Ligand binder design. Structure first.
Ligand SMILES: Cc1cc2nc3c(=O)[nH]c(=O)nc-3n(C[C@H](O)[C@H](O)[C@H](O)COP(=O)(O)O)c2cc1C
Ligand SMILES: Cc1cc2nc3c(=O)[nH]c(=O)nc-3n(C[C@H](O)[C@H](O)[C@H](O)COP(=O)(O)O)c2cc1C
Lengths: 261, 261
């Protein structure tokens, strides 16, 4: 904590800055001593990361970054932590000059120098990590269509059970599957298991109806199973036709009863 | 590029150093002017991250970290880049003082100052990201045992098809499934589809044989399907008994033919 051990020399200082400039990282220095704790230290890389000019950023708080996606709970945690003068690390959504939305990790830690406080903001981009997750998702997608098991039960009997919570993102795969069903028109009976699926959405019912109509024209009976009794009662009120389509408490039970003669 | 704009003051310098110390990040400064470009600038956090003392690091090249897991190709790329005085980013496995292996991302970028060259080494830990992938893998594991579908074909007939490339890690789930199969001893016929699997390993054939023996005692016929004709010819040479087990070209074909009276 001296000019001896610290090691002055302005040449050393220039080196440290260039290194920071080479890699885009958001580190800034604020001064509580000045009004509203304004930001004094800013690197060039900051501008490229936020897309904001250095002149605008200096003299103003990173408040302008906050927008609709900004999580008030995180904001509140930060406010608490400064009052507690204790370090805090949180992730908070932020907006650029062009409105681009990106995630920005913020780490704040108090300093005690010359009996004076200090604040530092560190911003670490989560984008590289997001790209990694996206790569994984793409792999899952190719994998998901492939898993899409096919296994005819018998001759003219086919089944396509669904397991998991059907999200809107996942729904695209299903609509595409409609084209495949036309190819499988040969199978007279199709059995769909909804038992895997925890719950069934109302929008889903509309999909079931469209399929039965297309299937009826093509001459393919549709069977629905894994329907909860409570759900069926609700369905009856909506339309007497719902009861028209054979319903089995479970897949094993439908399969066992199916054959009889 | 001057003491004016740079902004001297040793107090500012101590501020920058503590902030680096608070968060463990491997940044070091080397001097090509001296012999063998020795490292002069090192932070305390470096020691905790590498588990090496500052006195031993300073004066020596990061070459000691390299070990068995070190990738020569990555080393050669670095050597090429320095000669080409162009920045290079690579990921290279390293070793600690206790022999703990970890991944170390290295970024090198040349600097031109006062008509002198300078080299900087940046190390970023991929441990956090590793933990994240591990969390994902745990989910997949719970999900994988759960996905393990169960769908009896009929009364007495059950099938458990395999899809995907059977790794050694994956093999643990299968051995565990052996216990479940005992519970399923009720089903007289068990059909296993190897068609989904791209290839079959010779070690696998040992597993099939053990299963048929246990199954035969319990009184449970075992049917293998999806076996490639080329593979069957190879199997015939190893043991006639291989033919002994019924083999179908496909699952659909075996299912259709199955019933006949
Ligand atoms: C050092 C420091 C850096 C900050 N950096 C960011 C930031 O990059 N992004 C963000 O959303 N909030 C950041 N904040 C929070 C805001 O700058 C500000 O402290 C908060 O919005 C409360 O200020 P206000 O009263 O003007 O809203 C930072 C806070 C401090 C103290
Ligand atoms: C600035 C700088 C930092 C380096 N840091 C590391 C490091 O942390 N880990 C690593 O495996 N290699 C690192 N290297 C590579 C070695 O330090 C060294 O350059 C390389 O092994 C060739 O040196 P040698 O001829 O002694 O093998 C670094 C190289 C430079 C130039």
């Amino acid at each position: 904590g001296a000019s001896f051990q610290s090691f002055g020399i302005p040449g050393q200082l220039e080196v440290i800055k260039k290194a920071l400039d080479h890699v885009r990282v958001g580190v800034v220095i604020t001064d509580p001593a000045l009004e509203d704790n304004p930001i004094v230290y800013v690197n060039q890389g900051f501008v490229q990361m936020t897309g904001y000019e250095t002149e605008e950023i200096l003299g103003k708080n990173c408040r302008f970054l906050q927008g609709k996606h900004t999580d008030p709970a995180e904001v509140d945690n930060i406010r608490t932590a400064l009052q507690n003068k204790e370090p805090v690390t949180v992730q908070i959504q932020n907006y650029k000059k062009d409105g681009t939305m990106f995630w920005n990790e913020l780490n704040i830690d108090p300093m005690e120098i010359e009996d004076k406080t200090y604040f530092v903001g560190i911003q670490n981009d989560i984008t590289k990590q997001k790209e990694y997750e996206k790569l994984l998702e793409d792999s899952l997608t190719e994998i998901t269509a492939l898993s899409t098991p096919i296994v005819p039960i018998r001759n003219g009997i086919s089944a396509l059970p669904l397991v998991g919570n059907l999200t809107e993102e996942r729904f695209n795969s299903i609509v595409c599957t409609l084209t495949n069903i036309l190819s499988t028109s040969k199978d007279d009976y199709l059995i769909i298991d909804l038992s895997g699926l925890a719950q069934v959405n109302e929008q889903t019912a509309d999909q079931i109806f469209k399929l039965s109509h297309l299937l009826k024209l093509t001459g393919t009976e549709l069977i629905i199973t894994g329907i909860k009794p409570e759900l069926a009662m609700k369905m009856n009120k909506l339309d007497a036709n719902f009861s028209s389509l054979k319903t089995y408490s479970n897949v094993k039970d439908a399969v066992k009863v199916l054959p009889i003669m």
